[PDB]
Design a protein around this ligand. Structure first.
Ligand code: CHT
Ligand code: CHT
Ligand code: CHT
Ligand code: CHT
Ligand code: CHT
Ligand code: CHT
Ligand code: CHT
Ligand code: CHT
Ligand code: CHT
Ligand code: CHT
Ligand code: CHT
Ligand code: CHT
Lengths: 94, 95, 94, 95
């Protein structure tokens, strides 16, 4: 097995976050593209397990299948305090 | 023109209210006209695919104004506030 | 079991072809919506087995799984003489 | 900026040519750069998903000019004229 890497036209190897053709990918310090949950500077993001792209404004099923986590439009995971569920059930996040 | 879809069984009986056809659920009003969008069925809300009429279930659908989302349980019913338990790390649970 | 029917706002029951909200459906003479292959006035069309809508500009797998039939943009089935397969393999239809 | 995707195995060997990763096929040029779009591999043509790089198979894809379609066999190879047998009623068969 192995991993995916990315090098811009100038030969620079991508490490960390990198916008690649309208999508965002996260590479560890060695350049290896990461998939799944990633904690970057005390903040959580979710990278598609298939093509590795960051998911945003979406709900992703918990591991224990007990519930869902919401990823804000910028990709960051929303905390409980950020939610305001209105009486009818409308889920709002800040 | 404009109109509505209806379903009559082989016996000739016009479908009305909830009806399960070919493994999908549909809701017809009192006049047999297939409903789409939000439908209130005795205190609870449901959502029928706006384009195909089948009841949506276990899905989050964006709000009309786009300000938030709504969640439809696996039984089709719309989860209202009392049913939510948003855990501290953000894990959303519905019962 | 039963079938789907359609009545416009004026109470007229649809029979034959009917454009319904950007899609086309075929109803037999008794009003019952048809799905699958349909022969109308010596010409073949294919109505989606799921939602009954006519498919156009698409290839649909044969029953015997031996090949595919091509439905032109207007929904009608293309005959052999209508095809011109270019050397590289480009499939063109008239 | 602009650039290219590459794949190095855990051993450090740069993937080149055809490579099957996580159950999908990809094609890297001589410089290890992942190819997308049409690729000629020894007399035959293949098509790699323009957005994700994986080889398309058993699929009809619209032509660039939109004038016709192309068919990719289940093994990825592009079917050329000699392989087509269009039956009289319109049944398209490929071998
Ligand atoms: C080492 N690589 C060839 C992968 C980078 C481009 O120079
Ligand atoms: C990534 N986890 C879901 C495991 C942490 C809680 O956010
Ligand atoms: C309360 N609902 C939002 C479900 C009905 C539409 O107004
Ligand atoms: C009057 N209908 C044709 C709708 C009933 C027989 O199915
Ligand atoms: C006939 N169906 C109800 C299945 C299609 C919705 O337009
Ligand atoms: C799930 N349904 C509400 C559609 C069935 C009970 O009538
Ligand atoms: C007989 N229908 C009620 C189904 C048609 C509308 O008048
Ligand atoms: C509808 N059939 C495919 C059976 C006839 C040949 O076009
Ligand atoms: C012959 N192909 C069309 C497959 C190559 C692009 O020109
Ligand atoms: C130089 N690389 C980091 C690309 C090889 C080790 O996997
Ligand atoms: C990293 N993948 C090659 C899987 C995504 C294509 O952009
Ligand atoms: C189907 N492939 C051509 C990708 C495998 C043989 O190398």
């Amino acid at each position: 097995d192995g991993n995916w890497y990315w090098f811009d036209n100038s030969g620079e190897m991508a490490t960390g976050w990198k916008k690649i053709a309208d999508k965002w990918y996260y590479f560890n310090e060695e350049g290896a593209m990461k998939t799944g949950w990633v904690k970057y500077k005390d903040t959580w993001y979710y990278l598609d397990a298939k093509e590795g792209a960051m998911v945003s404004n979406a709900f992703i099923q918990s591991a224990d299948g007990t519930g869902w986590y919401y990823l804000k439009p910028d990709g960051t995971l929303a905390d409980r305090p950020e939610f305001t569920v209105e009486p009818d059930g409308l889920i709002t996040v800040k």
